[PDB]
Amino acid sequence: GVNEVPDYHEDIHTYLREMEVKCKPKVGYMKKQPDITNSMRAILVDWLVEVGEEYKLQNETLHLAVNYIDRFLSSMSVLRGKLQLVGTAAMLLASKFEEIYPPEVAEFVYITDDTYTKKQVLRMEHLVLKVLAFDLAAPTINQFLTQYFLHQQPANCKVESLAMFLGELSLIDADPYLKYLPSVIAAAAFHLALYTVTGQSWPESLVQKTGYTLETLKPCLLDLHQTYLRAPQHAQQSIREKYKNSKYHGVSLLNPPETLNV
Amino acid sequence: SMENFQKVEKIGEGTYGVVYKARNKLTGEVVALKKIRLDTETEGVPSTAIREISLLKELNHPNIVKLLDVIHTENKLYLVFEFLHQDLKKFMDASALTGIPLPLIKSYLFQLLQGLAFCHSHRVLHRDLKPQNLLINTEGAIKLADFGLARAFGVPVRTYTHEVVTLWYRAPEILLGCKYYSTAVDIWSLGCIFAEMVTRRALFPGDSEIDQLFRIFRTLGTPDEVVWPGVTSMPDYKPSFPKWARQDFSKVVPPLDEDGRSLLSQMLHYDPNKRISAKAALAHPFFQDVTKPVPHL
Ligand SMILES: Nc1cc(I)ccn1
Ligand SMILES: Nc1cc(I)ccn1
Ligand SMILES: Nc1cc(I)ccn1
Known part of the structure; x- marks a missing residue:
């Protein structure tokens, strides 16, 4: 309904895409x-x-x-x-x-x-x-994440926390995440969260929305996979601690997957 | 800094700062200056100003007040705005005897909707649409102004400030204390404004929140689960509300044709999800013949 601004989601998305380039x-x-x-x-x-x-x-x-x-x-x-x-x-x-x-x-x-x-x-x-x-x-990873969630059917809170979680991890490490646009990181966090909890991948409906394929998301997804894998070993932990709480469904405690299908 | 500006007169005070008409001594341009004092030992730059400036820098559209510059000192901020002759409230009051011509009304609503669609297309709620915040010039244009209470929203929307919108222009979803509101609340205000331009009296002039709801129900019919699903489950809904029948728009806005009345009802739908968008509103048959007349100033 109106809380998802159907007459505007498309124009808003297009605008944020232009704007995240400006604020990069x-x-x-x-x-x-x-x-x-x-x-x-x-x-x-x-x-x-x-x-x-x-x-x-x-x-x-x-x-x-x-x-x-x-x-x-x-x-x-x-x-x-x-x-x-x-x-x-x-x-x-x-x-x-x-x-x-x-x-x-x-x-x-x-x-x-x-x-x-x-x-x-x-x-x-x-x-x-x-x-x-x-x-x-400025468009944020979250602004893209919340919009991508809409494409789920049904909503899954574990996929939603987990993607939020991976997103925040990217904030920490300028290398390599300064090379990725918010919308690319958000997509890679959403794919990786989806794959980890459900098994499903980046949906066609979001390919159609974003123009991003799993091909074009490949580089960022590898860095994020690395980051996810190495997370318990990062000098910085506040995000892992934060995402242990029930508030975020304790998604940080989930063992990451070992590979993707590439 | 302000060496090139000559003050001409005071022209009032918005949600923050104080507003002067001025003249660029070098270019001859007449502007409005908004002086915002900086709390340099206490709170710094007001969030009101951070939102207004940032959002207006992004919002470039013929029906949105143009922000020309921001001039810094260590102690003050001056926003430089294109100057518009007066606000719609002053225009209405001036037009209390003579009335406003219907083509001008239709033109202004059309422009207001174009401005607003641009806002919503750029993820900005205005949240303070009232005649006092709408500015006209001598050439028949109208523009949204005073973005101090505005907000860049995400998709989907989250919980934002509840103390929003001047009472008379406040949508029933905000009144009944709903968790989430969206672009719909701005359309409600414009509906109220549409009606007000036709009658030059406020549609729902309440003395209080409870009085506000009573005014809305008595004119549009008390809502139920049929009209507005989830209304009776609303935080501040009261089972005890009197049950009034809808008042015909023949009584509500006599001057208004069948098209105007249809557009108005759609703007004042109780259900936020059915409330018409500004985008859709631009297509409504009311605007088939829209022109751009000049006001009588
Ligand atoms: N210093 C100033 C202030 C105003 I208001 C206008 C011109 N100069
Ligand atoms: N009269 C006015 C006021 C503002 I704020 C901007 C333009 N004209
Ligand atoms: N504004 C109003 C009108 C009636 I009839 C009852 C209460 N309040």
């Missing part, structure tokens, strides 16, 4: 940052996941925050000591954009252990706004 971070930005690394970024995102659980934030907020960060770091050199400042400001902005009841700025200051003052946070907020030119409405 620069693939190679980390090599151009003298003082920060993919490793440091992983620590940052992992921390944002915790923050997101402590404040019961929407998952969509977390994804938005990460888009903000990668685009900022595509334009601005940042020293290691200020990396967290950029992350706090992006989280703050994502919350203001997405949340009904964002946390107050004070709470954003508290979570950095008072590494930064309130004034630093607010000033960084404004700088972040200027660098992204207020282009904050």
